[PDB]
Design a protein around this ligand. Structure first.
Ligand SMILES: *[C@@H]1O[C@H](CO)[C@@H](O)[C@H](O)[C@H]1NC(C)=O
Lengths: 441, 52
């Protein structure tokens, strides 16, 4: 038997319903999401990391001159400094006083840390949505499996076939461009490959951490060696990756709305409480028992003994009943006015049972279904004492949930009196108009 | 890649008021405090707490 319904996209809050198959006693169904994962499709654009400046041994040509040549090295620099007279530990290196040239060379490489300490720039496109669903029904214990939230792919969970509809909201916390560093994700419109500026995030760009073609854009400039010293001095703009690591700002993990939790393997946003999720579950035919084979419950009377509209199961109610064939009977409240904690109760030939519920209404009025029967529960609920709680609300608050009977009375008096004032004025006007007409005629 | 032991700031004192959370922070070292709403508007907050 296929049961179709819509459940809110909430994690940790179970969805409860009664599967009513004509001719069979209701089967209690409870569906709870363990986690919801939005897994977008990503394409690695390039890898950024701290650069290393490699400086080969300078060519010191004594009593002569050399010329620099271009080489296929990132940000390669070469300059011939004429008129050098370097000294070594063993004395003057060159003989000629000024007819000597030092050719300095330098180029940029990926540092050793780049294997571990690097940021991955990704292009993010719409991917897939998956969830872990926990389901129990009737006398079958809790079973769970990974399912695809697409409304097409069915999943077999404890002999039950579950089809989870697509999320009503296509919202995703990732922009078209994200930067992944360590465990943190940043929404960052990184520069296109080959466009990174010196001292900025993209100063060093590599298509992959093991590529042999490195883009480097730093103001690497060779300076003249100091008089008499064999060395290759250079100036360069400080690594824009280190700078970025200082000014990263808040990661997506700390600013994603709806409480999304960001994970990286694979990149995904977990437990985003957006929209609702249509569902369809085919319960096995063996889980249903014929009506004549289940207990008959009658003479139901529901008394609310205590109630507070707290986020927890603050309500307590006692139901008196008369029945036959003592046995288990499911309990459910079809309306959203109250959420019942217990899923089923044991009924004797006569007596009473109690159940707990959570409600946001100051004057809750809800129907309670006791298998083949139902009763109406009414009462008053006190305000909760705790200002802050560490758990999410079980109930749902409606527009009229907070309006008390006194507030309704005042609204009725307001509208009735105002309307009566206008109505009386109009009636008096009509009466006088008729009197004037009769005066003329 | 290795596992490093990072400091653990002292547990804050938490006081509750109507729709308000009051935190008394007594850090030992500059400690980052971040918060966000779980609604449609994250309204994130990020500040380094250096003194009580
Ligand atoms: C499903 O729910 C039951 C009861 O809440 C729990 O024992 C079980 O571990 C849950 N399944 C998973 C995968 O957490």
């Amino acid at each position: 038997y296929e049961h179709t319904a819509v459940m809110p996209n909430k994690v940790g809050i179970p969805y409860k319903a009664l599967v009513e198959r004509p001719g069979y006693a209701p089967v209690h169904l409870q569906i709870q999401l363990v986690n919801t994962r939005i897994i977008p499709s990503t394409n690695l654009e390039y890898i950024t990391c701290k650069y290393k400046t490699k400086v080969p041994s300078p060519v010191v040509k004594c009593c002569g001159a050399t010329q620099c040549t271009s080489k296929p090295h990132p940000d390669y620099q070469c300059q011939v400094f004429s008129g050098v007279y370097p000294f070594m530990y063993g004395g003057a290196y060159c003989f000629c006083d000024t007819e000597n040239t030092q050719m300095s060379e330098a180029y940029v490489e990926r540092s050793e840390e780049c294997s571990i300490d690097h940021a991955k720039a990704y292009k993010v496109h719409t991917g897939t949505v998956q969830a872990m669903v926990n389901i129990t029904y009737g006398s079958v214990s809790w079973r769970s499996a990974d399912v695809y939230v697409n409304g097409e792919t069915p999943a077999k969970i404890g002999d039950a076939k579950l089809i989870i509809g697509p999320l009503s909201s296509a919202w995703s916390p990732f922009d078209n461009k994200v930067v992944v560093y360590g465990h943190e994700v940043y929404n960052y419109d990184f520069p296109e490959y080959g466009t990174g500026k010196a001292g900025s995030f993209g100063d060093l760009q590599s298509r992959t951490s093991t590529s042999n073609d490195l883009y480097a854009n730093t103001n690497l400039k060779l300076q003249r060696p100091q008089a008499g010293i064999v060395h290759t001095p250079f100036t360069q703009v400080p690594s824009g990756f280190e700078r970025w690591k200082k000014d990263k700002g808040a990661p997506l993990n700390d600013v994603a709305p709806f409480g999304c939790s960001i994970a990286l393997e694979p990149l995904r946003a977990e437990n985003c409480a957006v929209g609702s999720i249509p569902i369809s579950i085919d319960i096995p035919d063996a889980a249903f028992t014929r009506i004549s084979e289940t207990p008959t419950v009658s003479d139901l009377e529901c008394k609310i003994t205590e109630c507070t509209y707290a986020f927890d199961f603050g309500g307590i109610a006692t139901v008196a009943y008369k029945s036959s064939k003592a046995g288990n009977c499911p309990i459910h409240s079809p309306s959203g006015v109250a959420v019942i904690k217990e899923n089923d109760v044991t009924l004797a030939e006569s007596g009473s049972f109690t159940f707990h519920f959570s409600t946001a209404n100051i004057h809750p009025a809800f129907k309670l279904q006791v298998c083949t029967s139902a009763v109406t529960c009414k009462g008053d609920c006190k305000p909760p004492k705790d200002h802050i709680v560490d758990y999410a609300a079980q109930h749902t608050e409606s527009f009229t949930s907070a309006i008390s009977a006194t507030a309704w009375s005042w609204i009725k008096v307001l509208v009735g009196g105002t309307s009566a004032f206008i109505v009386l004025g109009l009636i008096a006007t009509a009466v006088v108009a008729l009197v004037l007409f009769f005066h003329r005629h | 890649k290795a596992k490093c032991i990072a400091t653990l700031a002292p547990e804050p004192l938490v006081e509750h008021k109507h729709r308000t959370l009051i935190l008394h922070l007594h850090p030992d070292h500059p400690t980052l405090l971040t918060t966000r709403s779980l609604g449609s508007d994250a309204n994130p907050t990020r500040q380094w707490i250096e003194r009580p």
